[PDB]
């Protein structure tokens, strides 16, 4: 979607492998703010939104 109508998707009831996001070189910017990128496999979340 466009940025004025940006698409929000809920992520819930899943086990998430974020290591395929870190190890992929396709992303020009991979920047996390309130959490370390390498600790994402060690934590549990709810209210995940893309």
């Amino acid at each position: 979607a466009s940025v004025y109508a940006w698409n929000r998707k809920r992520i819930s009831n899943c086990v998430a492998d974020y290591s395929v996001l870190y190890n992929s070189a396709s992303f020009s910017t991979f920047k996390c703010y309130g959490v370390s990128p390498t600790k994402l496999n060690d934590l549990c979340f709810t209210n995940v939104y893309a």
């Binding site: 870190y22 070189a25 020009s28 370390s36 990128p37």
Partner: protein
Amino acid sequence: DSFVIRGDEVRQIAPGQTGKIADYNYKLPDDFTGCVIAWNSNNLDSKVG
């Protein structure tokens, strides 16, 4: 320490960075002191083939 990397990977030669060559090629410590030097070498380290 001399090496050749890509142009977007020069941000990963730094303390406290997350990245690819930082983890598996060249890691700098958090208490690193010194200077990182980077310059473009497309005229020397590149071939048309």
